């Protein structure tokens, strides 16, 4: 797995790979690793696939109940804390979860919370989780600026997953892109890594080590 999310001028970029493995066996290349909690909030899926699926859909139900009761959009801080408090109750039982809860509200602006199954809850600007996280961090750290355009930020997220997909054996398949704005998230397509690699190699001049 490789999942990332980063804050910038135009909001948040979320980018994930698509591969799921059972040992060396590639179970699926078409896994949806971004959960659509609601039209404004996104969550990423790393660790236990079921745990992330089940509890982040549940989170969507809790967010809906909040805004029905309070007549106001739930904050990213409050939404992330509902999830982190829940998994903390299950601490020790064996839940496996590493997720970024991403949202863009009036009072907060673009906000990302890393939530963990040991109970960790961290606010931050750039997060990267999975077996291929170290590869994606390299591309992110050396190219990240706050004043990136939406177009360039989307590409950076795509390129960082590609970097991981290439080197990490347990990452690949395809890249899913999302752009989170204040008015909600916008899906920016599914990108097959096989086709994307050759396209990027030619246009960018990168991956000279690989023969194409």
């Amino acid at each position: 797995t490789t999942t990332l999310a980063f804050r910038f001028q135009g909001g948040i970029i979320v980018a994930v790979d698509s591969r799921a493995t059972a040992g060396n066996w590639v179970a699926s290349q078409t896994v949806k690793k971004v959960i659509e909690i609601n039209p404004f909030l996104l969550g990423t899926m790393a660790g236990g696939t079921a745990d992330c699926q089940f509890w982040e859909t549940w989170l969507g139900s809790q967010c809906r109940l909040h805004e029905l009761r309070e007549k106001e959009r739930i904050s990213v801080a409050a939404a992330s804390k509902i999830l982190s408090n829940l998994v903390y109750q299950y601490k020790g039982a064996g839940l496996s979860m590493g997720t970024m809860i991403c949202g863009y509200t009036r009072k907060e602006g673009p906000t990302i919370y890393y939530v963990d199954s040991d109970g960790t809850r961290l606010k931050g600007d750039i997060f990267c989780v999975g077996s291929g996280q170290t590869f994606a961090y390299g591309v992110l750290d050396s190219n990240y600026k706050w004043d990136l355009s939406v177009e360039d930020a989307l590409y950076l997220g795509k390129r960082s997953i590609l970097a991981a997909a290439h080197r990490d054996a347990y990452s690949g398949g395809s890249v899913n892109l999302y752009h989170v704005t204040e008015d909600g998230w916008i899906y920016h397509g599914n990108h097959d890594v096989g086709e994307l690699f050759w396209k990027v190699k030619e246009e960018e001049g990168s991956f000279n080590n690989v023969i194409g």
């Binding site: 859909t57 549940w58 139900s61 809906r64 109940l65 029905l68 009761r69």
Partner: protein
């Protein structure tokens, strides 16, 4: 004294029959179902001019496709609304779909007779539950503290109910537009209200398939009141 779950010699539950009397003392609420949507309207009935009337919340959202109006001891309705909202959301979690308006109503009505010596007494509030689903279209239900619910084409509850229902009997037909229904609720509310009807002491709302449940602005309702006045002066 006597049991809370006691039957009368006529075969009625004393406490349920008495709660129905409390609902008769409540402010008027009216619902009208059409093929373009369902309209819900209420009398706010502020006890003093210093009471900020927009804080009177007698029309409430249960889900995007289900709204609800209340009449009687309105404090009792809060836990009923909470349950309704939870039931609507829970069903979406379990089944990845909207819940049927009837099923939601049935879930609310299951709470009603859970009283004895569970809660200590029945609810002292009646509900008009309005909504839309793909199977049965636009629907309006009347949920009582007896646990019984009837579907209605149009229904009025509260202190001006029997006078309003007689008026709804004459006015409703199967080809009403949404605009016609809005004016009709306003007309009948104005008839049964003690004080003169305006945008501050009355409230409108509707549920459509496209836009879902919406409570009307005071500015929007004020225009419909002015439109009503002119069309009644037109003959």
């Amino acid at each position: 004294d006597r049991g809370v779950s006691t039957f009368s010699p006529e075969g009625r539950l004393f406490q349920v029959e008495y709660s129905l009397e409390a609902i008769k003392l409540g402010s008027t609420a009216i619902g009208i179902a059409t093929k373009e949507g369902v309209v819900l309207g209420v009398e706010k009935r502020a006890t003093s001019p210093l009471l900020e009337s927009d804080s009177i919340e007698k029309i409430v959202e249960i889900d995007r496709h289900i709204g609800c109006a209340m009449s009687g001891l309105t404090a009792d309705a809060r836990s009923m609304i909470e349950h309704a909202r939870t039931a609507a959301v829970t069903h979406n979690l379990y089944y990845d779909e909207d819940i049927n308006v009837e099923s939601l109503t049935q879930s609310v009505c299951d709470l009603a007779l859970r009283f004895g010596e569970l809660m200590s007494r029945p609810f002292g509030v009646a509900l008009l539950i309005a909504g839309h689903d793909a199977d049965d279209g636009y629907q309006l239900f009347h949920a009582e503290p007896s646990g019984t619910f009837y579907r209605y084409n149009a229904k009025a509850i509260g202190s001006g109910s029997e006078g309003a229902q007689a008026e709804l009997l004459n006015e409703w037909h199967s080809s009403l537009t949404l605009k016609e229904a809005e004016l009709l609720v306003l007309k009948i509310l104005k008839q049964v209200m003690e004080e003169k009807l305006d945008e501050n002491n009355a409230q409108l709302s509707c549920i459509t398939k496209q836009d879902g449940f919406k409570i009307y602005d005071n500015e929007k309702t004020a225009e419909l009141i002015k439109e009503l006045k002119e069309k009644e002066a037109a003959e």
